[PDB]
Design a protein around this ligand. Sequence first.
Ligand code: NDP
Lengths: 497, 497, 497, 497
Amino acid sequence: RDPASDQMQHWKEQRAAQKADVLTTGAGNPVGDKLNVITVGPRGPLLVQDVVFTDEMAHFDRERIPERVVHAKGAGAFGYFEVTHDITKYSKAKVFEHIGKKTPIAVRFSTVAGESGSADTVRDPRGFAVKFYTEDGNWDLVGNNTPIFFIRDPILFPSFIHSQKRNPQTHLKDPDMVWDFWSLRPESLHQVSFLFSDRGIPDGHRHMNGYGSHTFKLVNANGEAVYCKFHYKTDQGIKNLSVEDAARLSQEDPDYGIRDLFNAIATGKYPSWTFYIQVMTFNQAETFPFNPFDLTKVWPHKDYPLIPVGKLVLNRNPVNYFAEVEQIAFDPSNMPPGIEASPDKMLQGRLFAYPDTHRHRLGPNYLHIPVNCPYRARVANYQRDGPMCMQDNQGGAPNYYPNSFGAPEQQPSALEHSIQYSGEVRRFNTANDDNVTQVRAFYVNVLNEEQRKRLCENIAGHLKDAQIFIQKKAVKNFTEVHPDYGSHIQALLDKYN
Amino acid sequence: RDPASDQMQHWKEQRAAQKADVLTTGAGNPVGDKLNVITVGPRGPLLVQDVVFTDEMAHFDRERIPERVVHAKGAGAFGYFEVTHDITKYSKAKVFEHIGKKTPIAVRFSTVAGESGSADTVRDPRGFAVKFYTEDGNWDLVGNNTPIFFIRDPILFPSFIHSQKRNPQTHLKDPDMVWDFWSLRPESLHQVSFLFSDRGIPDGHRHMNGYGSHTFKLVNANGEAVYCKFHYKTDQGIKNLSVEDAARLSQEDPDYGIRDLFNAIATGKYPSWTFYIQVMTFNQAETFPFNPFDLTKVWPHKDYPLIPVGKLVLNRNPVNYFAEVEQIAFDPSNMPPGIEASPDKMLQGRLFAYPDTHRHRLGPNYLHIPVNCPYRARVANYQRDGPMCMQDNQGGAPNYYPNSFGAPEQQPSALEHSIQYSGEVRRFNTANDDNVTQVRAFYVNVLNEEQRKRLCENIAGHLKDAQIFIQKKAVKNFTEVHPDYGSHIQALLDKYN
Amino acid sequence: RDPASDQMQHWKEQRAAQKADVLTTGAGNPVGDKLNVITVGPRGPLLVQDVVFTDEMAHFDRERIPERVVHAKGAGAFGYFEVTHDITKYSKAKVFEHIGKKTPIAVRFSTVAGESGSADTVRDPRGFAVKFYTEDGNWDLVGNNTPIFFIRDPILFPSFIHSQKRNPQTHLKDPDMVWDFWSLRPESLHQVSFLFSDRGIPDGHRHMNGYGSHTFKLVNANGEAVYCKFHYKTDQGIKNLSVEDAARLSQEDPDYGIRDLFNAIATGKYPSWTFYIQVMTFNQAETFPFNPFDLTKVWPHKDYPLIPVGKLVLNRNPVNYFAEVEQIAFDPSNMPPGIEASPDKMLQGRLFAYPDTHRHRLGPNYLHIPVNCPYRARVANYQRDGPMCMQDNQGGAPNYYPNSFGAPEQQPSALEHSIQYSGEVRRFNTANDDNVTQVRAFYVNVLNEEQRKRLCENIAGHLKDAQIFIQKKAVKNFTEVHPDYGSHIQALLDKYN
Amino acid sequence: RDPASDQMQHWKEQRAAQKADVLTTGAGNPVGDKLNVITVGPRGPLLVQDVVFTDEMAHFDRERIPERVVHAKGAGAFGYFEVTHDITKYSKAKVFEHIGKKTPIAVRFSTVAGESGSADTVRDPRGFAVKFYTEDGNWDLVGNNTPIFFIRDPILFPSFIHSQKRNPQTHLKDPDMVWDFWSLRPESLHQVSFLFSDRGIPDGHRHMNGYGSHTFKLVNANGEAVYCKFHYKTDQGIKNLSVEDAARLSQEDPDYGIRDLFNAIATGKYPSWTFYIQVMTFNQAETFPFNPFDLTKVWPHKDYPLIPVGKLVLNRNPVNYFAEVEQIAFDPSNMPPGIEASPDKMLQGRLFAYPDTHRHRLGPNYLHIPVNCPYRARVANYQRDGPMCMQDNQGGAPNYYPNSFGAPEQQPSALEHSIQYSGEVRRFNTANDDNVTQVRAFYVNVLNEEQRKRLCENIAGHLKDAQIFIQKKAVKNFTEVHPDYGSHIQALLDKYN
Ligand SMILES: NC(=O)C1=CN([C@@H]2O[C@H](COP(=O)(O)OP(=O)(O)OC[C@H]3O[C@@H](n4cnc5c(N)ncnc54)[C@H](OP(=O)(O)O)[C@@H]3O)[C@@H](O)[C@H]2O)C=CC1
């Protein structure tokens, strides 16, 4: 049988020739029995003085923690990232120090929509989270499997998710809400084209690219800075499932992703991604036609060639799923000195948003869990006593700054980068930004005829459930994209209507 | 379209001719805009003084609460229970006071295994929770769709669930663990026969019976007591899905149950259950062949006729799903004066187990949520300040008992019932109890030939994934049940092997 | 006896001629007894089936919620705020709409240092929190009893509190940490003069002024804006305790504040504060000598006359202490359209800081507690399901924005005010700002000789416990203030040394 | 200066000749500065992209955990317990295995009434918690400084505490509630005599005895059992403060206990307690005049001589207060094989009560904190994933019992002890038990005349604040004790009245 099917047997194979341990309570008390409760005779009530039953049950009651607000489903792995090119001219970060550096990494694949226990094979953006344990602490690159996103305003992310998830009264999936929100916000027409294309349903998790999709800013040792995007493309080649094959797999194995990834890791065919960077200088950022920090826009390849940096390989399965996938925390705020944030609105939103949900779900001291703890660095600061602190709490060191008792002092070299902006502070409306150029280029340059047919078929198949006027608004936006696009969509609609 | 598909439209239909309200923050502050964040110019970073974005995001982060440890999936409804017979000779409870009493009820259907978001149509015991708002507070009847259960010892319930759920390392469903636990505990051979029979997959939720399955004890006004079981059978007739139809529906609509129940409630075809009681006197309990409080045994119909009491009808959908299904709490401990607990070990376990998980998941003051609050009675006790108390905290009344300031005093009439037991207090082993008689009667009396064929087919189809020696132990237990049973199972096994 | 001593008797006096209620469980089940547990005979163990004991104990275990990080001790009251002057030329807020408006208010007095249960009469800044239930939601004015504060940088507030509180290893109060932090940050020399003056220990809570101390910004109906400060001064006259009287009261009645305030409210002598505003125009803000938004600076009275607005009166005691003082939440972010935040760094910090601790301590839905709920307005937004939501969750309304189902839409009139700033975005150092002018004016103009003697005595009495070199640095800062000041401090020091 | 005054200096003395560390964020990111926030120019608002401020503030907000429901104030120490006599004839426990065994121990002193931050020197029972890290897991002996307690029924403990704590409406201490509850429950007259005697206020914490006060049961290797009580008496001699000295110290140093204990531990005068056992055989338990398991009764010394076992010495201060005193959990349920619970009602209540509050306050996985973790044993069981699990979660081992993959199996030798009880299961009333004999013996045998005078003075001084009829009921109970007692109390009363 497959490794995922012969897991516990392998455990018995590894733990041969050693005697089985003694079943004890949480507090090391060895127990008499765990196959019967204390009673008053054979047909009598229970006694409170049966402590083992009470302890076991009271710990069993609290086995669940709040699922993530988004990307609930998940499959994780561990590996090491390796450098192959010099980019020290761009960054000071110890992750790009020299050639031949092994940095431990954790990775997690997720589905933005599906809750804990849904069928994985569904038309939804896949999430690709990477965490590097750099010598200067952690770095979290939280990417999507698409180079863009539905919206460009952070204040709309809650509503968006509310539309993508179940109904408030019926508690069902409703295409009505999804298509209403999509038609009202035209800035999404691009991402929709990506979502309903052939690359919408990837082959498990080893056959899909991953994109940073955020305009980061690198600073060199000299203090100069350039804007950049991170990419990483698969070495196993892009592979995607037909709608019928995904439909069959959603019934056969609802968790095909986790099974495939685990079988591949236990088999020895180590999956690998190649790491690329797009670089842009400040003058180019000033002379770019669109807004160079808009999340819905991409950078054309011709004007911005890719630059190889390194590769990712995953060579370890999680010893336990819960402690290494359910309890892992990715903060886009964890950026080492050498990688800064930009004026990109969505990145600014995420910097504040992520740690709050991490404190709610895991616990106020989530940074002390061994999967999150930065063991390749040293933690020393003026954070103190919180709920469930598993460390020594840094002993009796002074806990106020500044002081005069030789306490930890700031590093003057890790200062941030400064750049001047001009204009009033107010609310700017961005609903008037371009939405039709890049999607048109994607339509008439990237796709062939058969893939256009499949795309229109998928969109019509998912859109046939909406109301009449939402359908009219959607097809109006699509004919705004291109006449052929809208005409095909509308034709298949009246075929379904 | 169907009501579940035309929900929000109906809302717009109900709220016609009234102007749309003003979008405000949590604290009633009317907002300027919710379509853009404060920036420093058009391409500048965000400001902290954008309070609305911070508030919205920080509330969006905490939208998830820990899912139930079991029975995560759910569909709820509201109705009223109505009496049609006099059982005042048996109970003092105000729910059975007289003929013509309308008691408000909440009901919830669930699946013991499937987490939040799985396909509903699966071979697993369905849970049937009812809550009566009796004039003397709440009463929670937490039943199964089968008259029995897998085990008879409460200390084994955690392990059982751990076997029924995902693997700890691979995080997949493993038939290995399930069948190992089932073969090691022969007391389950009965329930398995129920689970893998034709009634294992019911038709939505309106086509399945519900059973209390616990030996309760009723006490009259005179103080005399009799043991009893509660039943309630559907008026729409038993209906079940073929394995192929359930397989297709698990892909088409993963939430067929909620959809069907909601469409039926909104259509007007009010589903109804008939309420029956089995009664037994103390002498009968002393002269019963098996243990009359064993959870794996049933009471033969001939010796114990059914007694009609009333009917349940569901005539209201939840106004909001989360506040009326996600936040409802059923405690088998909430039993009004007139319905007592018995020496049944599993009922004793549940009495302590349920409130603990309810305090963990919802909150220490979960009894103040309008869906749980006993509005048909008066709450007055010496419970005080806790986290998030939404009530007046009963004002400045004395908070200690006893006192001399005319505070709430105990009701001397609601005393419990007392009965003497003989024998030492110790651990009794119950693994030597009968496991083969009732299952044999179920096999050779209840079933026809075709249903036997289907049962053996289903068991073999689910068991073909286990190891060799677990298969040998399972077929050994089955041949212990009956030779034909085991022979058919083994034949289909070597066909699959 | 005094009302605070004859509280519960009065309850018995109010509830005369009505029969005592029935003691019930949380779920309305009337109980048999609450003076003995179920046992197996007279000298036997307990039974689990004693549900009432389990429920009572399990609710008693969770009676504590995390105390506030600061201002733990507290005494609260309720009243109404009344207007007496027209300031509509300055603000649009419905709280200053016209003359003769009654706005319900809640107020709370606290001590920044002392934990829950310490002696109130101590040398520490007193906190004065007011909450108006304006027709456009809540407004929280969270003031101090001094017009200034120790620091001017928000990032230093944690360290500051850590110094003011107990030692990490010994868990005692240490003057060493306090005086080290004070000497290292000279910007505090002003507030210290206020803290160790005669007005440091007020007479209970009805004999102290209260100051907004934050530079707010008002906007009129025309859209023009002016900077302002809020003041409110007592009508009972400033009264302060001698160090010996406060020392005696700290032993006699550790809670003198709560007792005095409650006795005064129950006696009928309704305490009252007069509400004043300081106003400044943008040109004045540009031509001000110091930084007009510095928290350590005041505005000289001569150049900025006070403007009366209204008065506060407290005419109601809390019906229950816990539900009306322990569970009240003041957010400086709750500012109605008409009162904006300024570039004041500390106000910006507080806007983000307060709601986070409020979500941690109370609960994610703390805005649903009747003491915090804005009942004088209407809540309608796209916030949804959270832990322990006591409301109807706004029923089955659409939960995404924008939509096309006549949902709540933004109010275009409540837009914020915009003003341009020039200069790079970076870290500015403020440790070089003036610290000696206003403190010198306070010393040689405000105080007489005897009060100077008392101030120097108090500072020396509290400073005699520090190390030698911390003493040298403190007296160096004081001689930087003025030679006589430092010389007196040093003289009394060598007297104590 | 004293060690408690020269703590942090000593740290600087220990960390001489090493360079100060680098101040980093929780996630190892070294920081630029912590003395100023990011602004838009010198007088501009803050930016969200200042991550360090957000992280620091959000962690500072959650620095508080719910204080214990009782015994909030505390002072802790660490040491080792050493055996000096053979009691293997009585117990099998590895703590009493042989002579010369060093078992690590943690100890904590507390005050049952005073909240976190009150003056320690007050008339209230002191709590003495000891935790042994035995080779077979932890053992928690949670004793009082008196051999008795106020009540004998667990269901009354909440009400009792509610009376001892602050008023619900006024939030003050009220002698009315305390004396009403004491007069209504005469079973307390004994403990009151102990509480208001000279030994009510001990000299710090090194000058008071400690008593198990619970009737435990020991079982030998042979399986025979005997009832027992644990005692431990100080080697520094009983020392107590006069009411005037305690009054002065409550103003001078509110935390005299922690200061004294820490100074003594850092000075080298290692405090020591001598460990004694009272033993009783089953026949003696059957022929005892009173109820031998009543919490309000003691065992006369003459009939039951003390048996020395070992001594406790404290030779280590807590490295950090919070992680070693605020986060320590004592469960009277943690009893190694060899020390059992008895039919004592209060011990049965505590066995269930303690772990629930421990799960609420600390966290569902509180047994993983290094101060609570049983490092002298091995934990291996079927408890799994919970909130904030800091361990490896025992890797991919099977998580269900029983199984067939060589998993941890129960220890058949650690079985519990069984004994038969006779009589019905019901509610027995114990308010008719003797309350006057032992208190009379304590009065006329243990005390001299001067101590009687002091006792009556203290009781009158605390009782002068109650109502008239509560005073009459109290003096009636006291004259029930003895005529002279009541007459003295009443005389001093009319002197105060
Ligand atoms: N309360 C009880 O005692 C129950 C007993 N049984 C079975 O009846 C056996 C003999 O007791 P007896 O008094 O003769 O019961 P009866 O034969 O008198 O009554 C038959 C019962 O079996 C139910 N039943 C029939 N087919 C199925 C099925 N495929 N899945 C689930 N339930 C089914 C019937 O439901 P329906 O009412 O729709 O006919 C009915 O309740 C027992 O061994 C037990 O297995 C089953 C359920 C309840």
